[PDB]
Every structure is written in structure tokens, then in C-alpha cells.
Design an enzyme around this catalytic site. Sequence first.
Site, short mmCIF file in Angstrom:
data_model
loop_
_atom_site.label_atom_id
_atom_site.label_comp_id
_atom_site.label_asym_id
_atom_site.label_seq_id
_atom_site.Cartn_x
_atom_site.Cartn_y
_atom_site.Cartn_z
N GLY A 110 108.26 -63.96 -3.52
CA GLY A 110 107.87 -64.11 -2.30
C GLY A 110 108.14 -62.58 -1.52
O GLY A 110 107.30 -62.45 -0.53
N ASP A 156 114.84 -65.47 -11.41
CA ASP A 156 113.68 -66.25 -11.84
C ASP A 156 112.68 -65.84 -12.95
O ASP A 156 112.46 -66.30 -13.82
CB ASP A 156 113.01 -66.71 -10.66
CG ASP A 156 113.45 -67.65 -9.51
OD1 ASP A 156 114.71 -66.83 -8.95
OD2 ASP A 156 113.39 -68.66 -9.25
N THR A 517 124.06 -51.47 -34.78
CA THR A 517 125.20 -50.80 -34.73
C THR A 517 125.71 -50.40 -33.03
O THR A 517 124.85 -50.47 -32.22
CB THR A 517 125.13 -49.24 -35.43
OG1 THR A 517 126.27 -48.48 -35.31
CG2 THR A 517 124.00 -48.49 -34.86
N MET A 562 133.75 -44.85 -28.07
CA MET A 562 133.32 -44.74 -29.43
C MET A 562 131.91 -44.27 -29.46
O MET A 562 131.35 -43.99 -28.48
CB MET A 562 133.67 -46.00 -30.21
CG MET A 562 135.10 -46.29 -30.39
SD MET A 562 135.48 -47.65 -31.78
CE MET A 562 134.36 -48.81 -30.76
N1 LIG Z 1 103.09 -65.07 1.74
C1 LIG Z 1 104.19 -64.49 2.45
N2 LIG Z 1 104.08 -63.49 3.50
C2 LIG Z 1 104.83 -62.90 4.25
N3 LIG Z 1 106.17 -63.03 4.06
C3 LIG Z 1 106.52 -63.81 2.90
C4 LIG Z 1 105.50 -64.43 2.22
N4 LIG Z 1 106.49 -65.34 1.27
C5 LIG Z 1 107.82 -64.85 1.26
N5 LIG Z 1 107.81 -64.09 2.54
C6 LIG Z 1 109.07 -63.48 3.08
O1 LIG Z 1 110.00 -62.93 1.74
C7 LIG Z 1 111.09 -63.64 2.28
C8 LIG Z 1 111.82 -64.13 0.90
O2 LIG Z 1 110.82 -64.85 0.30
P1 LIG Z 1 111.33 -66.14 -0.69
O3 LIG Z 1 111.65 -67.37 0.21
O4 LIG Z 1 110.20 -66.65 -1.65
O5 LIG Z 1 112.30 -65.58 -1.91
P2 LIG Z 1 112.29 -64.53 -3.00
O6 LIG Z 1 111.75 -63.17 -2.54
O7 LIG Z 1 110.99 -64.82 -3.85
O8 LIG Z 1 113.65 -64.36 -3.84
P3 LIG Z 1 114.02 -65.43 -5.04
O9 LIG Z 1 112.87 -66.26 -5.57
O10 LIG Z 1 114.81 -65.01 -6.21
O11 LIG Z 1 114.92 -66.65 -4.40
C9 LIG Z 1 110.82 -64.99 3.18
O12 LIG Z 1 111.88 -65.27 4.05
C10 LIG Z 1 109.83 -64.49 3.83
O13 LIG Z 1 109.96 -64.01 5.30
O1 LIG Z 2 128.78 -45.31 -35.99
P1 LIG Z 2 128.81 -46.57 -36.93
O2 LIG Z 2 129.42 -45.74 -38.17
O3 LIG Z 2 127.25 -47.01 -37.17
O4 LIG Z 2 129.68 -47.68 -36.52
C1 LIG Z 2 130.46 -47.76 -35.30
C2 LIG Z 2 131.86 -48.11 -35.36
O5 LIG Z 2 132.61 -47.01 -36.33
C3 LIG Z 2 133.57 -46.08 -35.74
O6 LIG Z 2 133.32 -44.96 -36.22
C4 LIG Z 2 134.79 -46.47 -35.99
O7 LIG Z 2 135.32 -47.19 -37.17
P2 LIG Z 2 136.62 -47.33 -37.88
O8 LIG Z 2 137.50 -47.48 -36.92
O9 LIG Z 2 136.68 -48.15 -38.64
O10 LIG Z 2 137.12 -45.88 -38.14
C5 LIG Z 2 133.26 -46.01 -34.16
O11 LIG Z 2 132.13 -45.25 -33.86
C6 LIG Z 2 132.68 -47.63 -34.00
O12 LIG Z 2 133.92 -48.36 -33.92
MG LIG Z 3 111.02 -65.96 -6.18
#
Ligand SMILES: Nc1ncnc2c1ncn2[C@@H]1O[C@H](COP(=O)(O)OP(=O)(O)OP(=O)(O)O)[C@@H](O)[C@H]1O
Ligand SMILES: O=P(O)(O)OC[C@H]1O[C@](O)(COP(=O)(O)O)[C@@H](O)[C@@H]1O
Ligand SMILES: [Mg+2]
Lengths: 761, 761
Positions: A110, A156, A517, A562
Site C-alpha cells: 500500500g 507480509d 560451512t 572465526m
Molecule cells: N492506493 C493508495 N493511494 C494512496 N495512498 C495509499 C494507497 N494505499 C495505501 N496508501 C497509503 O500508504 C499508507 C500505508 O499503506 P498500508 O495501509 O496499506 O500499509 P503497508 O504499506 O502496505 O504496510 P504493511 O502491509 O506491512 O502493513 C496508507 O496509510 C495510505 O495513506
Molecule cells: O572453515 P571450515 O574449515 O570449513 O570450518 C569452520 C570452523 O572451523 C574453524 O576453523 C575452527 O575449527 P576448530 O575449533 O576445531 O579448530 C573455524 O573457522 C570454524 O569454527
Molecule cells: Mg502490505
Amino acid sequence: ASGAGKAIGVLTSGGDAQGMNAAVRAVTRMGIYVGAKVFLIYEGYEGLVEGGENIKQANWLSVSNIIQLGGTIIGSARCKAFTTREGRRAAAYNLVQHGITNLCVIGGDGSLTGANIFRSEWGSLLEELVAEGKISETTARTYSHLNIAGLVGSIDNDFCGTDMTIGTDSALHRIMEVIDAITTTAQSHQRTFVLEVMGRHCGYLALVSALASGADWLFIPEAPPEDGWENFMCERLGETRSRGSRLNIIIIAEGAIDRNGKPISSSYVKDLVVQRLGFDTRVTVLGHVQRGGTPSAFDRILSSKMGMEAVMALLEATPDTPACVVTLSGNQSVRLPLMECVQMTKEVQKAMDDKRFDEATQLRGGSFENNWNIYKLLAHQKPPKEKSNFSLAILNVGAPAAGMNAAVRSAVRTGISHGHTVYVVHDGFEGLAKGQVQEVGWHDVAGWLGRGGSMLGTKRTLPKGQLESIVENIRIYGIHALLVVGGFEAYEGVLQLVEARGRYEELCIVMCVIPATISNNVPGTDFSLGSDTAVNAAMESCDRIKQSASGTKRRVFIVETMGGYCGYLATVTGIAVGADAAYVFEDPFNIHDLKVNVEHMTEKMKTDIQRGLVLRNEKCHDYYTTEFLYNLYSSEGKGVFDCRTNVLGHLQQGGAPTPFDRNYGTKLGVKAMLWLSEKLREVYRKGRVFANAPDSACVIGLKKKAVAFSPVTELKKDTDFEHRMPREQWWLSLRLMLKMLAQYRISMAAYVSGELEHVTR
Amino acid sequence: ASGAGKAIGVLTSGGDAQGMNAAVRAVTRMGIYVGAKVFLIYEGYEGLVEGGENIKQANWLSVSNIIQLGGTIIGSARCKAFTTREGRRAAAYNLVQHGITNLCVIGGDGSLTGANIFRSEWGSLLEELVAEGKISETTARTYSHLNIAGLVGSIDNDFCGTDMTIGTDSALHRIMEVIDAITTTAQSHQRTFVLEVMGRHCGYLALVSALASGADWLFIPEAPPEDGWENFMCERLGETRSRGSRLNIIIIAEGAIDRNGKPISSSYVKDLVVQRLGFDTRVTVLGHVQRGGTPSAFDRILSSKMGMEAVMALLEATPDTPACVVTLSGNQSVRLPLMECVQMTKEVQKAMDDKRFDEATQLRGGSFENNWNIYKLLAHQKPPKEKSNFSLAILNVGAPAAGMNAAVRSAVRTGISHGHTVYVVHDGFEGLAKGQVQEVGWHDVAGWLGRGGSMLGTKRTLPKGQLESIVENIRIYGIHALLVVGGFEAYEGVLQLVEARGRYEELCIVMCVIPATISNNVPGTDFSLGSDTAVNAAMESCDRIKQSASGTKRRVFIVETMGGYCGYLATVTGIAVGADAAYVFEDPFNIHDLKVNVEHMTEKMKTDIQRGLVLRNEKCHDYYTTEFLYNLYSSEGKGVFDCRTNVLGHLQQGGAPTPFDRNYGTKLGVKAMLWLSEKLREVYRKGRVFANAPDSACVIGLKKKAVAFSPVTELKKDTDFEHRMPREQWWLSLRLMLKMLAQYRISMAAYVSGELEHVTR
Ligand SMILES: Nc1ncnc2c1ncn2[C@@H]1O[C@H](COP(=O)(O)OP(=O)(O)OP(=O)(O)O)[C@@H](O)[C@H]1O
Ligand SMILES: O=P(O)(O)OC[C@H]1O[C@](O)(COP(=O)(O)O)[C@@H](O)[C@@H]1O
Ligand SMILES: [Mg+2]
Ligand SMILES: Nc1ncnc2c1ncn2[C@@H]1O[C@H](COP(=O)(O)OP(=O)(O)OP(=O)(O)O)[C@@H](O)[C@H]1O
Ligand SMILES: Nc1ncnc2c1ncn2[C@@H]1O[C@H](COP(=O)(O)OP(=O)(O)OP(=O)(O)O)[C@@H](O)[C@H]1O
Ligand SMILES: Nc1ncnc2c1ncn2[C@@H]1O[C@H](COP(=O)(O)OP(=O)(O)OP(=O)(O)O)[C@@H](O)[C@H]1O
Ligand SMILES: Nc1ncnc2c1ncn2[C@@H]1O[C@H](COP(=O)(O)OP(=O)(O)OP(=O)(O)O)[C@@H](O)[C@H]1O
Ligand SMILES: Nc1ncnc2c1ncn2[C@@H]1O[C@H](COP(=O)(O)OP(=O)(O)OP(=O)(O)O)[C@@H](O)[C@H]1O
Ligand SMILES: O=P(O)(O)OC[C@H]1O[C@](O)(COP(=O)(O)O)[C@@H](O)[C@@H]1O
Ligand SMILES: [Mg+2]
């Protein structure tokens, strides 16, 4: 090149996805690093509308010590004024009063839809504004174009054009912290745990939570259950009891529905399970907890990267280029036009409204559909009426890494599903020599997802010494393929077997290496399985260490990480924690650089910031050890700060896998098994398998954009065998972001930003 | 003395409170340490009834590596057979078949009620059993008495005779992890967080959760809200908004009711808040999560202590002594007769059924009523129409300790409530010398509960050097009392001011020391504020370190803990993590002891257990440092195990306070302020305050049973000022439990167990 003389506005809107503070920090510091003015717009579009006090210019210290904070220090608000032109014109006015021709919006679908409509009307709003007399025609021809770089900040993941959003990983950390509370105890009663997750229209979090936890059942709006699911679910839980599995996990999205519009409540699923099974059934509802807690390491790195890339995209944008969304598809940064992403979001919403409902799940993204298919495949053993003569052995080689068990679980299930005879060898190449080969079944890997380390043994021993024993055991057990889950030793050992194919006919078997690793030092991939877990553990230690002064005393901590000669872990950990410096082998430093950094720290420490943190990779320098840096920083900082030292040893190693590592190992274990099956069928000729070409021994990748399969012989060119790391590592460009966020004036002409890309239909 | 020739049965029943595994481990290992046979009864009274395979004899390794596991590896089940004599006779039969005249029951109120009825009928059951012919008259005269030692394992804390139960602290860890996910973010929208906890009949978890989080409102069954609470709550949340507080916390027990029998649902409170306030309101329901996760440090120590004390009570019990419940009231171990505790539970249940309902809350225990009054007092500022000329200053001295902020918050609110003029001085005695004295209000300490470290500054500087400046600032600001929250330096500084009273008239002011330090090295108390947080962070690091070997490599970890010369932190951490050895200054060791322990480790490491863990206090030995132990263990363990090292530096320091520390600091801050007010009124004469007696300068205690006030001059005798710790520390008896759980044959004749005590009405 620099964006001097121009002003950037940064705002957050919507639900306060954790990791927003990291994105705001990177936007601010990159914006004033490149010379632009940065304006913080508080409460989002609310403060954009009212403006005035809500728009304040930022300095470097305005975003200091926020990267570890969840929520958003800028604050977010729902405003209906931005929906209407009356308030949107006021928003355009307030931007013009500060000369803000550049806007970064960090929010959900949004938020970015509103930003798109705000750009689309920016010319019309300015025209009506000058017509009404609040701005002169001059001062309106300038600012005639508004530059929008969008950042998707939401748990989301509902924005269709984008694969990963800020806060998704950390919301999943919250979810898996709660599920691990259930699964890691010694199970006593027969009980069912129903988790209601806060996705009211997108089921992505419910899906990746189900995959990470191995949920028995999943309700998501994208794929509502078929008619009569009531019986099918209850029967599944029944055979789960008959198996002896004392815990059932039901993941139910808030937006859970049936094939009709009727929503399925968590209470209904509870009472249903209680009535037909009698298991001790309680619903867990996270609610606001999902947006809570600290941002995960991934969220901090990616928010920092995308915030920096947002600013850079905002400076290189001419009047003609459209509004963009800075995101990452895979590991590659990319910019997608805002209009197309908004259009896709509208198409999926219309499809989900019983238009193309069965075909809405594909438009959500191939990753969603693939994740759901992998989930259902691994959830319940369907009968594999197909069978094949092929047989494969799964190794764990090197050190233990968080997520090996998840990979082995998926490889076992997928191989059994394809009719293969799956073996697991304990202790890697040692066991393969010693013949510790044990055929495995579906339920032998039950509950291996959340278990850290390695259920199968790991050994670092390379196969060359006991090569006669390895070929003997391959002959005895009829091993046609070999899946090696491990670090640099896994790749090196498979390379040794490939090079020895000429001597031994039995070694001409298909081989696959899953890089697993802590160090992320395996060539052929960007992320070794379990590096994310190590980074998260390391930053959590560094955050705890950095908090120990509690704002009063001013102190610098030398933390030793490491990773061997591979500096990846140090550098990303330094980014996540806002470390002043991450000394690594790949960036050789001398005493001149140390004096520069120590004087830099001393100057910073005289300012408002009181907690310094420099990281040192364990093998960065031969002489300038952690003790050396301690002596240096404490001597030169005399009368300004004290110095302390903490060598994070195996605190970075033994933790349970993060949800990324569980899902990642799950997916590439499936993909490695798919590739194994395809290669084995492509190589089966004359009634036997004979894998001699270099392509038959590959490292499963994820190298830039999607998963890849790099032959081990080809990777031998780009491998530093002495240091046990690749020669060219993708992550060295992140050093420039690390140093820039710490006020180091470094000419980052070597950093490459993602270019414009159209959405993939 | 030893219990040879007799058999002990251990079972868990009811909801699997985390920390049960620690209690079972201690019961088993103490039982076979003292020569008795230990039998593990699986699924509780279920396996008691069916018996046979469900009753297995335990060895030392049967309870190995379970102390960190939540739930119960023995398993628990609800069985109705034990309710009836038909199954209870079968239970008595199965105990006789194994010669189990000794039973340890680790469960809730229903479990211990069933154990009481089982003892009460043990003679009748045996008589009817021999009458029916399943046991001869001989073999029934022996086993004629069944010994029951009960352990209260439950998150409910519903057993009235007992103050603390196993799993309460860890359930609260789960609750506060979820609440801290909300509160520690940068708050953005105006929102309400309704937390439902499983207080379906007991409201203790909701109360302490509310107190620890500073909840705006509380619904508990013990004190239902008055009529018209709907308006009163909504108005409270309204002024909370007007204050600018963007988050409201509602703590609703599962058994939340009104003054009638009608339950109050979390959904009702949600919809109510939504309708009248419009805040973004979401309900969080923990469900099974409360019993999940690892047991907290407190739960592991106390479960180990009570399991050991259960066994010892079970051996020293003659035919005449009644069934007992081993519990701790305060820090003191105690045994309460099972019959009286069951009777009190029945009385409170009858009272809660609208019999003496207004007077049921007192019978729940004085701690419950006091906790609820403290909660309501600190929640909302009531108008203090009373006023007094007294004025007091609150110091933070020494290192920062988790829970100083909670103590200062409570001291501020309680002092304002009593009409005092409360000052806070930043940087402790430094600020008092420099005059950094700032009068404080109610909301100036808002949200200080969960903040770690010190919001006021801390400094270690003693007051003797700047004593002229301190008396000058006391004169300027009219400071009549002094509340010093800190470590050994806090006590020492107050001691210096008391000794200097003879020189300066102005120093004749009432003084109170709140011990707040990681080391727990302050004389006059058993638990310094924030020692619990350090112990929890220390074990969590040790658990992570111990988990890194991954079940295959044989490795010992030398983990170095803080605490100065005070070994408390090392030893309790060793108990919590099952460390083989915790080297501390208070137990001097030479190379002979080191060889004994290393050979002990080597022998243990050849067996099934593969992860060793020795702790070393930072100042335990002059020469045998962590590096020395590393070289020793790695040399002597050659060919058996590898050795690694980890110095937990400030990882043990900067954490947020554990829920114990928040509630503890809350309560003792109130109590210190109550004692300050009473002493200041007792000392006010001739129109001014003149505090010259030694009793006017005390350290608030909690020294054995309840809170105490030890004069600093009297504590000077039992203080080792060179080592900055008391000379006689209560916790040296826990070393014997530590060593016994690690197979060290130590004659523990010096350990004292709690004796029988009747319930306190
Ligand atoms: N079609 C649109 N036109 C203009 N402004 C918009 C539109 N949609 C959303 N907005 C604005 O963007 C703000 C936030 O949008 P929204 O409510 O949808 O949340 P979001 O951005 O999608 O985040 P989230 O999904 O994670 O909650 C709204 O308060 C609104 O002012
Ligand atoms: O780099 P690698 O050999 O793939 O494995 C990573 C681990 O081995 C280490 O070299 C340490 O191992 P050791 O403690 O047994 O000596 C670190 O880099 C890490 O904890
Ligand atoms: Mg959203
Ligand atoms: N773990 C699960 N979670 C949610 N739904 C599930 C799960 N497993 C099966 N289902 C659903 O139950 C229905 C029937 O399941 P089943 O797989 O056994 O038959 P199917 O016709 O072969 O479906 P599918 O296309 O997946 O192969 C499907 O709609 C499927 O989506
Ligand atoms: N972090 C962990 N450590 C140790 N054991 C674990 C952990 N997580 C789960 N388990 C164990 O795995 C066992 C198997 O049950 P689990 O719930 O984990 O999955 P499952 O239903 O049996 O099969 P699936 O892997 O497909 O999900 C459980 O009994 C549990 O004890
Ligand atoms: N009055 C009783 N007489 C005999 N046995 C009883 C009695 N009450 C409970 N029990 C037995 O103790 C078992 C467990 O008791 P209960 O159901 O009340 O849980 P609990 O011990 O109180 O633990 P929690 O409260 O934490 O859930 C029951 O299955 C039952 O067999
Ligand atoms: N934070 C709170 N949580 C739950 N109930 C509360 C809280 N604060 C006040 N109440 C309840 O609201 C009712 C009236 O509150 P109030 O304290 O203002 O009047 P009162 O007559 O003086 O009660 P009290 O005995 O505590 O002094 C009381 O029943 C009280 O228990
Ligand atoms: N661990 C923490 N670290 C930093 N700030 C915190 C922490 N916890 C709460 N806060 C801050 O404390 C502020 C005050 O609000 P809070 O929810 O904590 O309690 P309150 O309602 O204002 O008063 P009270 O202390 O009586 O509960 C919040 O804005 C929040 O930012
Ligand atoms: O024992 P204290 O003096 O009361 O405070 C405890 C803290 O001080 C310490 O001595 C360490 O402090 P420093 O790191 O500043 O040197 C540790 O014991 C602990 O972290
Ligand atoms: Mg109970």
C-alpha cells in the site's frame, strides 16, 4: 558523480517491519556521504502531509545506534489524506518547501502503491499548486520531476514483483523462536500446536514457517484446502500419532479460507482436532510479536545494501527513468519499475478474488509455488510406485554447519520419492572408507530440520589417503551417486575423486557438493549452508558485548570472529552490528591503516557515540593479532576510551539453524537430488552408470541470481587451496558499504548497483 | 548414613514444567551416589499403574545431558486409573515388585494430591493386595511404609503451601521474551498488546508477568475487576495515550473472571479496546509456548537442589514422619508436610468458589497479595495528598548490573507516593561530589524495567576522596536519605560515609544499600540484583559452546567466567550447565587436584559422554590460568579428547534483566523505600533528621528466609575488603552438589538440608 545540491527524503509507512532502521540508516548515511541533503519525514505520509516539524534534516549521528533496533525510529502512521488529492497536494507542497525532489519510501504494498500514484500525479499536483498560488511558476519548473526509489519493508511479502522484503527473515525468526520452544523440549504428552500467523492476505510467512518447522498441515489463502479437508487433516494427524510422533504442528494464516470465501479460524481447527483426535490442542497466536524483536542479520545486511542502492539509484535517475523498487532477486541487487510491480499486485489481488483463483498462486512468484510443493512433498510420504536401480550415498564432510541436517532430510525424502536407494555414511569420507554406510528411510530423518550440527558424523579427512577403501565400499554398496554436504573439504574431496576417476573406474559416479560451512569459503556459491546462522550468532554476541557499557562509559571492543582466511563472516557481521572496522585477510592492512582507524575511532569516540566495535578475522594478519590491536587501541585511546577484547570461539558454531538456513538447506537438498536424478538418467548407458565428464561432479550454487551447478574441475581455477577459499569472492564490494557507514572516505567507484529489470511476467 | 539396600522411584506427572529434567537428574544421581537404587517410572502414574516395562532402573548415564532440556525425558501422562483404587492398587503392586519403598513425585497440585491419597491408602492397598493373593504377607510387612518426597513441578504455582515451583521462572522467561519483542522496538503506531497467559485457575504467572513488564492492566482470577471496570480500564488506556505512551500492555489470565462467575475473554478485551480507543489491538496467546524452551538458570539450580534434597529427605525419613514437599521459601530449603499443603490448596479452591472470595487472595500467600499491591502501586500514579519535608537521593555505584533500573523505578514511584522529594544523581558518588543531582518524577522512570545496565550513570569511585564535595551537595539539596544501588563499592562507600559521620554532621542521614552486581559479592544478601541475569547469560553461552562439538568429537571446553574473587557465578553456572569442575578462589586447588580432575575427565570422556565443560573463575588462581588449564587438559587428554577455550567477557554483563531480576529489583526497591520512610520518621527529631546510630545505614538483604536490613558497620566484620567479597558465603554448600553431579566422591557431611516446617497458616 556526487549528488550535491539535491535533497533526499526518507520515510517509513505501514506496519513497522524490523530492519527499517537499518534501511533508514543506510539511506541517510549514503545520502550525506554523496553530498546530498537527507530529510527524515516522521510518521510517513502523515508527516509528509502535515509537514513542517515532521520534516527534519538528518546528520550522520541522527541514525546512530539504530541498526539493531526493530520497528522504526522515524515512525509510521496510516493516513487517509495521502489517498485523496487534497492531502497529496499538501504532501507535494511540503516536499517543494524543502527542495526534496528525491523520495525514498520504505513500506509495504500500500505504501508503494501510494508512492506510485504520487509520482504519477506529481506534475498535475505541482500545476494545481502553482495555479492556486502556493508556489511560483519559477521554483516549480525546478522540482518538476519527483524521483521515487521504493524499498519493500513488510513482513507480509505481498508485493508481487519482489522476491524478498525487509523484515520477512526476522518475522520468521520470531515464528521459529516460538516453534523451537515447542519442538526442542523432551516431548511428554500427545499434543497439537496450532500457530496462527499474522498474514491476513498473504500466506508466505505461513508457508516458510511450515517448511522451516516441518508442519503437519498448512492453511494459506493462496491454496485453500480442498473439500473434505477436515477428514484428510484429521487422518494425517492420526497416522502421525500411530508413527509415535508426539507433537503435531498446524500453521494457519490469518487469511486462511476454504475454496469458498468462508475463513478458517484457528479456533475451528483447534476444536476440530480436539473432537476427532483428543490431543492436547492449544492455539498460539503471535500477533504483534512478529514485527517485534531485533532484526536478523540478513535483514540488517540487506536493509543496509538496499538503502545504499536506493540512494544511488535516486541520484543516477534522469527525468525519463520511472519510479523503481530496489530489491534483491536471489543474491543479485535489481531495480524493478514501480508501476509494473503495482500492476502485478493488482492482478494477483483480482485473481485471488475468484477470477483466476487456481492460477493466482503462480502469479505470486515461482518461489511461492515451489516452496509449497517442496513443503507438501517433504511433509507426508506418498507411495513411490516408481522405482529405479540407482542408489546414492549422502556424506557430511568438514566441520559441522547449521543446516546440514535439513539438507540431508530433504535429500533423503526426495531421493526416496524418486525411487532411489538412499544411503547415509557417518563421518563423511572416513566412514566411506570404513564402510559406515547405512541405508536410510523416510522417518529416519524425522525432525532433523531444527537440529544444529550434524546427525551424521562429520570429518575433515580428505579421500585421497583411503581411496582404495572408498572405491571398495562404492563397489560393495553399489553407490551410483554421491551427495557431499560440507565445507571446503567437501569440495576438495569430490575434486580428488574426480581427478582419480582416471585411475579407478568405480569413481565414475555422479557427484554433488552442497556447500555447508560457517566460513562461507566454498567456491561455486555465494552462501554456504549455515553461514547465515553463524552471522546471526556472531552479531547477537556483538550486540550483547556492545550493550555492556550501557551508554555511560565509552569503550571499544575488539571482537575476534572465526572463518579461517575467509573474511566474509567478519565483514557481514561488521555491517550487521555497525562495527567501525572488520580486519580481514582479503584486505591486507599495515600499521599505517591501523593508525588511521584508531585516530578515526578516537575522533568518533569524542563525539556523541560512546560504544566502538572493531572486528578481526582470526587469520587476517600474522602479527597484528587481537592482542596487538588491544594494546594499540588502548594505548592510543588513553584518556579517551578503554579497550576490551572478546574472542567469539565456538559461540558462532553450535547454534540451531536460523530459519533461512533451514529453508535454504531444505531447498538446495531437494534441488541437488533433482539434479542427481536427471544426471544419473542422462549418464546411464550400457546397463550401468559411467560418469566421466566434468559436468557430472558439480557444486550446487546460488551464485548470482538462481541456483547453479559449477563443475568442480572448472572451479579449481578460482580456488585458493592454500587458504581454503575462492580467489574471487562476491562480497568484497560490501566492504565499501561497511567502511562508508563508519565515516571512512573511500572512493567506491568499484561498487556495482543493480540495473533496471522488467518483472518476469 | 548411606541409603544402601533401598530403592527410590522418581516420576513426573501433569504438565511438563521445564526444569523437571534437572530435578530428575539430581534425584537419580544423588540416589545412586548414596548407594540407593533409582527406578525411572515413565509417563508418571500411568506407568506406575501399568508398570513392568515402564519402570526401569537408572544408571548415572541415564540422566546424562538432560539438564538443559525442557519438558521431561521420563514423560508424563494423565491417568484416571490412579484416581480409583483399582489402578492405585496396581500402582502399589508395581512398586512392591521392585521393592520401591521410596517415591519422588515431580508434578503439580493434582500430582501431589494423588501422591498424598496414595500414601494415605498405602497400608490399606497392601492389605487388600495380600488378601487377594498377589503378594505374600511376608514381603508385605516390609514395604509397609511408603516414603513420599514431593517436588512441585508446574508453571501454575497453584500449590498453596509452596512459594516457588519448578518452571515458574522459565515460563516467565518465555512470557518476557514475547513481551520484550514488543517493548524493545522503536514504537511507531499507537497500539495495544493483549497477552493471554494460561492462568486458567491460578493468576500468579499473569501477576509477575505484569509486574515484570509494567502492564497497564491485569485480569487475574484471584482479584476479579470491580463492576464498571470496562470504563475504568479504557480511561486508563486513554490517559496512557495522552501521556504519549504509544504501547499498552494488557495481561489477561486464562481464568480471568469478573466478580460473578462469567469469564473475561482476551477477545472481549481486544474488541473493547478497539471500539472505545481505536488502538491497533492484537491478542497474543502463548499456549504451549509457556512450557517450552530451555529451563532458566534458576530453574536448573533449584531443580538440582530440590532433587538432591528430595532424595536426602527420603532417606532420613522414618515410618512416623509424614509425606513432605521439598521447596524453598526465600533462599532457604524447607520441607512442608504434604497433607497440610493439600489442605490449603483445597481451602483456597473452596474460597475461590464464592465462599470467602474476597479473602481467598490472602490464603494464596502473602507474596501474591504483596506482588499485586506493588503492581497496582507502580502501574498508575495515584494522587499523593500526603506530603513530607523529607528528600532522598538515589545513586547507582560500581559496575552496571541488570535490574538497577527496575530498582530505581520502584524507589522513585514509592518515594513519590510517600510524599518524598526524590532526587537521582548520575554517576553515583562522582555525581554526588560534582552535584549532578536531578529531581525526578513519576514518568521520568517510565519503561525502565526491561532496560539493562544503568539509566543513571554508574562509577566505581569511593566517596572518601571527595567527601567535602559530597557533604556540600547533601547540604545544598537538603538530602535527608540516600539510596545506593550497586555492588561492593556501593556498600563500601556507604560504610565510608557512616564512618565519617563523626567528622561531618551532614552525613548523619539514613542510608540504604541495594546490592546490585554481577558477581554477587556484596555482604548482607544472598542474591545481588543482576546476578541472576549474569548466570542466565553465562549458561546460555556455555550451552551454545557445549553444543558445538555435535555429538561425535570428544572435546572439553575451558570457559572463563567473571565475578572477581567471588566464585558464586562460576559455581552456579557449573551447576546449571553440568560443568565437570568450576575452579574458584574460595576453593583453593593445586596441581594434584588438577590431575585428579583431568584424569576424572579422561575416564568420563572414554564413556558415552563426549562434551566436557570445566569453568574457571577469572581470579581463582594466580598461576593456573585459563591458558594453563588448556595446556594441561589438552596434553593429558591427548588421544582421548581435544581442548578448546572461551573467555566469556562482557557477554555475561550487558543483557536485559531476566524476569527474576526485574521483579526482584522492583520489590526490594519498594522495600528499601518503605524502610527508608519508616527510619526517617523514627529518626526525625528536633525539627531535623539526625541519623547517627548504626541501624540507620543498612544493606537490604534477603539473606536466608525473608528480606533483612543488615547495618553496614556490623557487616564490616564479615567482609573481605582485599578480595571485595564476604568472608562467609552461603553458596559454598552448592559446590558439593556440583561435584556430586560430576561423579566426584566428596564426603558431603557439611551439607544442611531443610527440616520439617508447618505451613504458615
Ligand atoms: N492506493 C493508495 N493511494 C494512496 N495512498 C495509499 C494507497 N494505499 C495505501 N496508501 C497509503 O500508504 C499508507 C500505508 O499503506 P498500508 O495501509 O496499506 O500499509 P503497508 O504499506 O502496505 O504496510 P504493511 O502491509 O506491512 O502493513 C496508507 O496509510 C495510505 O495513506
Ligand atoms: O572453515 P571450515 O574449515 O570449513 O570450518 C569452520 C570452523 O572451523 C574453524 O576453523 C575452527 O575449527 P576448530 O575449533 O576445531 O579448530 C573455524 O573457522 C570454524 O569454527
Ligand atoms: Mg502490505
Ligand atoms: N502438508 C499439507 N498441507 C496442506 N495441504 C496439504 C498437505 N498435504 C496435502 N495437502 C492437500 O491435501 C489435498 C490432497 O492431498 P494429496 O497430495 O494426497 O492428493 P493429490 O491429488 O495428489 O494433491 P497434489 O497436487 O499435491 O499432488 C491437496 O489439495 C493438498 O494441497
Ligand atoms: N532442535 C532439536 N533437537 C533435538 N531433537 C529435536 C529438535 N527438534 C525436533 N527434535 C526431535 O525430532 C523428533 C521428531 O519429531 P518432529 O516434530 O521434530 O518432526 P516429525 O513430525 O516427526 O517429522 P518431520 O521431519 O517431517 O517434520 C521429535 O521427537 C523431537 O524430539
Ligand atoms: N485427587 C486425586 N487423586 C488421585 N490422583 C489424582 C488426583 N488428582 C490428580 N491425580 C492424578 O495426578 C495426575 C496429574 O494431575 P493433574 O491433571 O491435575 O496435573 P498437575 O499435576 O496438577 O500438573 P499441572 O497443573 O501443571 O498441569 C492425574 O492424571 C491424576 O491421575
Ligand atoms: N493496573 C491495574 N490492574 C488491574 N486492576 C487495577 C489496576 N489498577 C486499579 N485496578 C483496579 O481498579 C479498581 C479501582 O482502582 P483504584 O485503585 O483507583 O481505587 P481504590 O478503591 O483505591 O482501589 P485500591 O484498593 O487498590 O486502593 C480496583 O479494584 C483495582 O483493583
Ligand atoms: N529494553 C528497552 N530498551 C530501551 N527502551 C525501552 C526498553 N523497554 C521499554 N523501553 C522504552 O520505555 C518507553 C516507555 O514506555 P513503556 O512501555 O516501556 O512503559 P510506560 O507505559 O511508559 O510506563 P511504566 O514504566 O510504568 O510501565 C518506551 O517508549 C520504550 O521505548
Ligand atoms: O565485581 P564488580 O566490581 O562488582 O562488577 C562486576 C564486573 O566488573 C568486572 O570486574 C569487570 O569489569 P571491567 O571489564 O571493566 O574490567 C567483572 O567482575 C564484571 O564484569
Ligand atoms: Mg496443577
